[PDB]
Amino acid sequence: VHLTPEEKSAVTALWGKVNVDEVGGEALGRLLVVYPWTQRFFESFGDLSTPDAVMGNPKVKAHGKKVLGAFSDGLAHLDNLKGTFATLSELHCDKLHVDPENFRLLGNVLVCVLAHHFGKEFTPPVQAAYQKVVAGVANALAHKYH
Amino acid sequence: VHLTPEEKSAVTALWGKVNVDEVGGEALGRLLVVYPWTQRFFESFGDLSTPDAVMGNPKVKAHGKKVLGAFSDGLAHLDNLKGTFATLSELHCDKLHVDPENFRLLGNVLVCVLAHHFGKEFTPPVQAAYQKVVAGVANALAHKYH
Amino acid sequence: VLSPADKTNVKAAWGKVGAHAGEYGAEALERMFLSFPTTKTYFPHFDLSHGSAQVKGHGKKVADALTNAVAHVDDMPNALSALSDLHAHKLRVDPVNFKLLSHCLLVTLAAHLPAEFTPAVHASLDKFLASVSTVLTSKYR
Amino acid sequence: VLSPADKTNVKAAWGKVGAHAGEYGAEALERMFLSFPTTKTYFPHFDLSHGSAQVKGHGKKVADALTNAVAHVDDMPNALSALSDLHAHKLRVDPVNFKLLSHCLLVTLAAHLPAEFTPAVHASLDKFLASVSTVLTSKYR
Ligand code: HEM
Ligand code: HEM
Ligand code: HEM
Ligand code: HEM
Numbered sequence: 001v002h003l004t005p006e007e008k009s010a011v012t013a014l015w016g017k018v019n020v021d022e023v024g025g026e027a028l029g030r031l032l033v034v035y036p037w038t039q040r041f042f043e044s045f046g047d048l049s050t051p052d053a054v055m056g057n058p059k060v061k062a063h064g065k066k067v068l069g070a071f072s073d074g075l076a077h078l079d080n081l082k083g084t085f086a087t088l089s090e091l092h093c094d095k096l097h098v099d100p101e102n103f104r105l106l107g108n109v110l111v112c113v114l115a116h117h118f119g120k121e122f123t124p125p126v127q128a129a130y131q132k133v134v135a136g137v138a139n140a141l142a143h144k145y146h
Numbered sequence: 147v148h149l150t151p152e153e154k155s156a157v158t159a160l161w162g163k164v165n166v167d168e169v170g171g172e173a174l175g176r177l178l179v180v181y182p183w184t185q186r187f188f189e190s191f192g193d194l195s196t197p198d199a200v201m202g203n204p205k206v207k208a209h210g211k212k213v214l215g216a217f218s219d220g221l222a223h224l225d226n227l228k229g230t231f232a233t234l235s236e237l238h239c240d241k242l243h244v245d246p247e248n249f250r251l252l253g254n255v256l257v258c259v260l261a262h263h264f265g266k267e268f269t270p271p272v273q274a275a276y277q278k279v280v281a282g283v284a285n286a287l288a289h290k291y292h
Numbered sequence: 293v294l295s296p297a298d299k300t301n302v303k304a305a306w307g308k309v310g311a312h313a314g315e316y317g318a319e320a321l322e323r324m325f326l327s328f329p330t331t332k333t334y335f336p337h338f339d340l341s342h343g344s345a346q347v348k349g350h351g352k353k354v355a356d357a358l359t360n361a362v363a364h365v366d367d368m369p370n371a372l373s374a375l376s377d378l379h380a381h382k383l384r385v386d387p388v389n390f391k392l393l394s395h396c397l398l399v400t401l402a403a404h405l406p407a408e409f410t411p412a413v414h415a416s417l418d419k420f421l422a423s424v425s426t427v428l429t430s431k432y433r
Numbered sequence: 434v435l436s437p438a439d440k441t442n443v444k445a446a447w448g449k450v451g452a453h454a455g456e457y458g459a460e461a462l463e464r465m466f467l468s469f470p471t472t473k474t475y476f477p478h479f480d481l482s483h484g485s486a487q488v489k490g491h492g493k494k495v496a497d498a499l500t501n502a503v504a505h506v507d508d509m510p511n512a513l514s515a516l517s518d519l520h521a522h523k524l525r526v527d528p529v530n531f532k533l534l535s536h537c538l539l540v541t542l543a544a545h546l547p548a549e550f551t552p553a554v555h556a557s558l559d560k561f562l563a564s565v566s567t568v569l570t571s572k573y574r
Contacts (some may be wrong), residue, residue, distance in 0.1 A: 036383035051553040097333040115543040129469040183525040261402035274326040
């Protein structure tokens with residue numbers, strides 16, 4: 001975004017250690033649990049009645065992997081998140097009707113998951129850089145809303 | 147900001163009718179009355195104990211005129227707000243220590259003031275243009291924070 | 293919390309709304325759709341065209357609910373329970389959107405009640421809409 | 434509204450914090466200052482440098498108050514009356530900032546209580562910090 005080369009390196013390097021599969025399933029599940037109203041878009045997923053039911057739902061897990069996948073690919077275009085997510089921005093608006101506020105919530109959940117995972121390694125300065133990223137991605141995804 | 151030409155004309159047309167002296171005092175006074183926490187910056191202004199004490203305070207009125215004066219200038223450089231507001235942004239941060247959320251509250255108050263003053267003339271679409279404008283200014287004013 | 297003063301202010305300004313509540317409700321929606329386009333994501337099933345009967349119909353419903361909250365200013369949590377349930381469990385509108393509608397409701401009132409929209413009334417009305425918003429979002433989690 | 438499970442969850446989690454609460458208080462502030470630099474506007478009189486005794490000391494103060502709140506999870510409004518006063522009438526921190534510190538505290542807990550930071554506990558702590566926030570900003574106007 002407006003990431004410092006140093007801030008760019010910190011992001012880049014932590015990410016290389018990330019199991020997208022697991023982090024993605026966990027970020028999305030935590031979202032559905034912490035902010036239950038987000039479940040409004042996943043009725044067709046099934047049983048989201050309990051934390052256990054959400055965290056275990058394979059439809060949730062697989063959606064999480066798809067979302068983090070796309071997120072992952074965006075870290076390669078940190079200089080043009082806007083052009084990288086344009087089509088995804090239109091889809092979310094025009095087809096999915098997802099309020100962009102949701103992008104923000106996930107971002108924050110994502111940050112909690114990384115801290116959870118990396119403990120020590122997820123230092124204040126590393127968090128600062130990730131916060132800039134999540135904000136940047138949320139902004140890019142909301143960009144084509146009208 | 148993303149102002150269509152027809153949004154820019156609508157902003158400009160209306161602004162032509164505004165008495166910056168008067169709207170300035172009204173907007174600042176109302177801010178201090180609706181969000182009393184904002185009074186934290188004006189303890190040297192004296193009595194702000196009641197709505198009448200605020201609205202009629204010669205210091206609030208004078209300050210209001212100064213703020214809206216700076217804002218009107220911003221309206222002639224809608225193309226380069228960040229540029230226009232840079233030294234003011236630096237000052238608000240480094241000297242005044244004003245949380246930028248204050249800039250968004252003032253923006254909202256200003257929109258109500260314009261609605262109050264223009265009645266029916268402040269149409270849904272004119273409000274939409276002004277919403278873009280106050281957000282752009284708030285953003286410009288917060289750009290130099292660090 | 294609403295003070296006695298706030299309560300008088302709200303009953304007074306809402307009193308003036310009278311029979312226009314419906315139209316004002318519809319207008320607040322339109323302003324919200326134009327200024328905060330993201331709010332449109334909750335009405336994919338609506339014709340959001342200018343003078344849509346759906347918007348008109350919806351504006352009345354919202355206005356009727358606010359009128360009901362004013363009528364029960366000392367028991368809002370109970371007067372609005374049903375609506376609180378609906379929003380929490382079915383509609384699931386993100387909380388931030390309430391602040392957007394509130395703001396557009398304030399704009400509409402300002403635009404229509406120049407004489408009553410005093411600083412003091414403005415303050416009371418803001419606190420009021422914040423309280424209604426808090427109630428409607430109280431059962432979210 | 435904290436459920437019985439929530440209160441339990443919170444008391445468990447905080448239970449584990451123990452002797453480190455002060456350190457976690459300090460670390461959450463540091464995380465806030467770095468991630469949301471606008472929050473620094475309320476601490477112009479502090480040395481915001483890493484490991485500053487002012488930040489350390491303040492972290493302790495915040496942690497202790499959180500502790501006291503967990504202890505009076507049932508009577509928060511009353512246990513934190515003085516703090517609600519201080520913030521409403523003296524400090525006057527804009528309410529948006531409470532969400533930023535809350536988030537940084539969650540992050541801090543996550544990073545240090547891996548086993549204990551389950552999805553359900555995460556949910557409870559969030560609601561808890563929200564409730565604490567609500568109490569601290571309840572007398573603002
Ligand atoms: C990091 C931010 C996000 C990214 C990069 C992202 C990306 C994606 C991608 C790549 C798809 C695949 C669909 C397709 O290509 O047809 C998708 C679908 C979808 N996303 Fe997003 N998403 C994000 C956030 C969210 C959030 C926060 C929600 C709601 C809480 C959401 C709701 C959905 C839904 C409902 C679908 C459709 C899934 C289906 O067809 O079953 N997304 N998203
Ligand atoms: C549209 C947004 C604003 C603009 C364009 C603006 C502009 C100005 C200007 C031109 C000055 C005088 C600069 C100087 O002393 O050299 C000033 C001072 C000041 N502004 Fe801002 N301002 C804005 C919003 C705010 C808000 C919302 C607050 C607080 C809630 C605020 C707090 C102050 C304070 C405390 C001073 C110094 C007053 C004194 O003691 O002389 N400003 N502003
Ligand atoms: C204080 C503010 C609000 C009030 C008083 C209010 C009140 C109502 C009422 C009375 C209804 C109709 C329920 C029925 O059919 O009996 C309703 C439905 C609805 N509201 Fe809320 N609401 C508020 C805020 C919001 C916000 C901010 C949004 C989203 C931006 C929203 C989205 C909806 C939707 C999507 C429906 C269903 C409409 C339909 O399909 O007919 N509401 N609301
Ligand atoms: C989790 C919610 C919070 C709690 C429990 C909390 C608690 C406290 C406590 C215990 C004190 C010290 C009171 C004393 O000195 O006796 C304090 C002071 C203070 N707080 Fe709050 N606080 C919270 C949120 C915030 C936020 C979000 C900000 C601003 C971003 C803030 C700004 C301040 C400031 C500036 C002081 C005075 C510092 C000094 O001058 O020493 N607080 N707070």
